[PDB]
Amino acid sequence: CGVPAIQPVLSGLSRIVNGEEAVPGSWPWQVSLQDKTGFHFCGGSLINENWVVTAAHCGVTTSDVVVAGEFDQGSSSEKIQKLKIAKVFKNSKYNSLTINNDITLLKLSTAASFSQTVSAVCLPSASDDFAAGTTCVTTGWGLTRYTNANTPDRLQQASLPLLSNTNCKKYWGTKIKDAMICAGASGVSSCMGDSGGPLVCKKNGAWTLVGIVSWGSSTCSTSTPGVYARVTALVNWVQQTLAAN
Amino acid sequence: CGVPAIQPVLSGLSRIVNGEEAVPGSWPWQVSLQDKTGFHFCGGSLINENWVVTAAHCGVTTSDVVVAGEFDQGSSSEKIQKLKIAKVFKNSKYNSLTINNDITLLKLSTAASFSQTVSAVCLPSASDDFAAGTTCVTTGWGLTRYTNANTPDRLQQASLPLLSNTNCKKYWGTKIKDAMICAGASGVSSCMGDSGGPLVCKKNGAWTLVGIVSWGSSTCSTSTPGVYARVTALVNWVQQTLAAN
């Protein structure tokens, strides 16, 4: 896991305003969730050929589909993979009021066929410490279907610092609980990440899942952090679900 | 960035005389600067959907238009984008007497629509080192400046080695300032670059803007280097302007 076939190119543009375009295929765990209207409504991460992680607040059913190996939603060439979902596991301590514990697992009804452009991310340990001030990446198709346009829909990337939960409370107050982590307020928005999409950090040379898009600034400001689901807090649940199903 | 959908073909003819025609689409960041009335006066590069980099001595105003996705200027059958300019940001350390610090940013009033033939060049870090003798690529319509040759109006390319500035002063003397870079004099011209246009090298398999066509020979010369603006010396100001505007 965590070691793409096509390496990402990150430039200095990835640190500022709305980030930058990714290199096609360079984030191969990146998935789209589509409904039956064909509408992209959330992101997610393959953690193997059978299993996808997403946010609970994404509300996935077994009538949704997982899309792998997209770059441009507006494209027709792209050899993508459209996968059916066998079973949706929502974390039982999910509070839709507080958006805490914001994680769902999806077991696919058909296995993903891993290639150069489709592969897994790595899951952290419950013990892993990702310090404040560590620069980590978020990707997705977040920035559009938005306002005063539409325009082509190509996978964007941004480089953003981890905060402490003490420093994050200065923007969100009591909304922040221990099963969350914040990133950003750095001069770049986090709104490229889709809800349920990745926040990844590189740990022993491997890109690893540290966060899952939960919510952000109501106006996508480059001065207010995004709020993620703290995977390292959720991972004993993920491990139990996997061992049992 | 730096990774074209339509892969450039560079043969030996890019290495002599005045270079060769490019494959259409294959240098997707390349733009043309025109005035109100449609005179092509300068070149530029897209760095994203909102921003173009060009030369300060180009004297761009918000009347001028930016044309993207062009190959043959003589064709009305090309699906090109003509883009309007919002503001123009010259570098204030631009010395109109030595032509040093020769760079301008244009912010577009109307965003570029990225496609198979329109997309962005990468920018270097301020610490990037690009060695002498590294072979890099300059493209443009500069041959059309030769009014009574009238000339081929298709995009050209040439492959030309970088020089050290020590070695460049054997040609141009004390005109050569630290915020400059020279390339060529090995048997192929540099005159195909339009003023403002790109000099690109590949870093980690991505095409990266190392130079901006600043000055040199008034005629196409195979044995004199061309002189460019050194993007790595300028790249801090760029990030800074973008971050704020």
In whole angstroms, what is the distance from residue B195 CA to residue B55 CA?
Answer: 7
Segments forming the whole domain that contains residue B105: 28-120+233-245
Residue type, A20: E
8 A C-beta contact, residue A210 and residue A198: no
In whole angstroms, what is the distance from residue A34 CA to residue A80 CA?
Answer: 13
Closest CA to B98 of B211, B191, B178, B177: B177
* A242 and A227 inside one domain: no
The answer to whether residue A11 sits within a structural domain is no
Tokens 């279907």 found at? A145
DSSP label at residue B237: H
* A162 and A242 inside one domain: no
Using alpha carbons only, give the angle A203, A206, A209 rounded to the nearest 5 degrees: 75
Which tokens hold the place of B10?
A: 């560079």
SS3 call for B56: helix
8 A C-beta contact, residue B91 and residue B101: yes
Which of B125, B204, B235 minimises the CB distance to A9? Answer: B204
Q: Specify the DSSP element, H or E, that contains A85.
A: strand A81-90
8 A C-beta contact, residue B122 and residue B231: no
Question: Chain A residues with CB inside 8 Å of B242's CB?
Answer: 13, 16-17
* B130 and B44 inside one domain: no
SS3 call for A151: coil
| Binding-face residues of B in 205-224 toward A, CB within 8 A | 205-206
DSSP label at residue B12: G
The answer to whether residue A52 sits within a structural domain is yes
Determined by which method? X-ray
Closest CA to A160 of A27, A1, A24, A20: A20
Identify the burial level of A152 via C-beta atoms within 10 angstroms of its C-beta, where 0-12 means exposed, 13-18 middle and 19 or more buried: middle
Residue A13 φ/ψ region, left for φ over 0, alpha for ψ in the -120 to 50 degree band, beta for the rest: alpha
Q: DSSP labels for B176-206?
A: --TTEEEEE-SSB--TTSPTT-EEEEEETTE
In whole angstroms, what is the distance from residue B161 CA to residue B184 CA?
Answer: 5
User: Which residue among B14, B26, B190, B195 is the active-site one?
Assistant: B195
Phi/psi of residue A208, nearest 5 degrees: -130, 140
A83-100 CB burial, b ≥16 within 10 A, e <16? bebeebbbbeebeeeebb
The answer to whether residue A4 sits within a structural domain is no
DSSP E strand boundaries for B27-121: 30-34, 40-48, 51-54, 65-68, 81-90, 104-108
In whole angstroms, what is the distance from residue B78 CA to residue B67 CA?
Answer: 11
The A206-215 sheet, strands edge to edge = A20-21, A156-161, A135-140, A198-203, A206-215, A226-230, A180-183
In whole angstroms, what is the distance from residue A171 CA to residue A34 CA?
Answer: 32
8 A C-beta contact, residue A186 and residue A160: yes
* B224 and B177 inside one domain: yes
Mark yes or no for CB contact A9/B120 under 8 Å.
no
* B130 and B20 inside one domain: yes
* A114 and A139 inside one domain: no
SS3 call for A196: coil
Q: Specify the DSSP element, H or E, that contains A237.
A: helix A231-244
What residue of B is the nearest CA neighbor of A157? B1
**How many angstroms separate the Cα of B81 from the Cα of each of B31, B65, B73, B111, B209?**
10, 10, 13, 10, 22
8 A C-beta contact, residue B104 and residue B45: no
SS3 call for B243: helix
SS3 call for A203: strand
In whole angstroms, what is the distance from residue A158 CA to residue A144 CA?
Answer: 15
Instruction: Please provide the distance, in angstroms rounded to a whole number, between the alpha carbons at the two ends of chain B.
Output: 21
Question: Chain B residues with CB inside 8 Å of A187's CB?
Answer: 243
* B144 and B61 inside one domain: no
| CATH number of the domain that residue A34 is part of | 2.40.10.10
Which tokens hold the place of A114?
A: 């891993």
| Binding-face residues of B in 90-129 toward A, CB within 8 A | 111, 113-115, 119-120, 122-123, 125
SS3 call for A119: coil
**How many angstroms separate the Cα of A151 from the Cα of each of A74, A170, A205, B32, B111?**
9, 35, 35, 23, 10
In whole angstroms, what is the distance from residue B109 CA to residue A5 CA?
Answer: 38
How many of the other CB atoms lie within 10 Å of CB of A148?
4
Closest CA to A227 of B104, A240, A185, A241: A185
Domain count, chain B: 2
The answer to whether residue B243 sits within a structural domain is yes
Tokens 């971050």 found at? B243
8 A C-beta contact, residue A152 and residue B114: yes
Which tokens hold the place of A164?
A: 């402490």
The answer to whether residue A6 sits within a structural domain is no
The verdict on whether A57 is a catalytic residue reads yes
In whole angstroms, what is the distance from residue B44 CA to residue B30 CA?
Answer: 6
Which tokens hold the place of A165?
A: 């939960």
The answer to whether residue B112 sits within a structural domain is yes
* A134 and A149 inside one domain: yes
* B104 and B144 inside one domain: no
Tokens 């360079």 found at? A26
Which tokens hold the place of A167?
A: 């420093």
* A203 and A133 inside one domain: yes
Phi/psi of residue B103, nearest 5 degrees: -150, 140
Instruction: Please provide the distance, in angstroms rounded to a whole number, between the alpha carbons at the two ends of chain A.
Output: 21
In whole angstroms, what is the distance from residue B184 CA to residue B160 CA?
Answer: 5
In whole angstroms, what is the distance from residue A188 CA to residue B238 CA?
Answer: 16
Mark yes or no for CB contact A11/B113 under 8 Å.
no
Residue type, B17: V
The answer to whether residue A9 sits within a structural domain is no
Which tokens hold the place of B226?
A: 């061309």
8 A C-beta contact, residue A25 and residue A69: yes
The B206-215 sheet, strands edge to edge = B20-21, B156-161, B135-140, B198-203, B206-215, B225-230, B180-184
DSSP label at residue B14: G
* A129 and A214 inside one domain: yes
* Distinct helix (H) and strand (E) counts, chain B: 2, 13
Question: Chain B residues with CB inside 8 Å of A12's CB?
Answer: 123, 125, 235, 239
Could you tell me how many residues make up chain B?
Answer: 245
Residues 6+ apart with CB under 8 A from A160: A15, A135, A136, A137, A138, A183, A184, A186, A188, A190, A226
Q: Strand A135-140 relative to strand A198-203: parallel, antiparallel, unpaired?
A: antiparallel
Closest CA to B22 of B157, B184, B170: B157
In whole angstroms, what is the distance from residue A183 CA to residue A19 CA?
Answer: 14
Could you tell me how many residues make up chain A?
Answer: 245
Identify the burial level of B34 via C-beta atoms within 10 angstroms of its C-beta, where 0-12 means exposed, 13-18 middle and 19 or more buried: middle
Task: Determine which of B7, B29, B45, B49 to mutate to test the interface with A (most A C-beta atoms within 10 Å).
Answer: B49
Which of A16, A23, A152 minimises the CB distance to B3? Answer: A23
Q: DSSP labels for A6-37?
A: S-----GGGGSBT-EEPPTTSSTTEEEEE-SS
Which of A17, A21, A152 minimises the CB distance to B1? Answer: A21
Residue type, B90: K
In whole angstroms, what is the distance from residue A72 CA to residue A27 CA?
Answer: 13
The answer to whether residue B222 sits within a structural domain is yes
* A143 and A209 inside one domain: yes
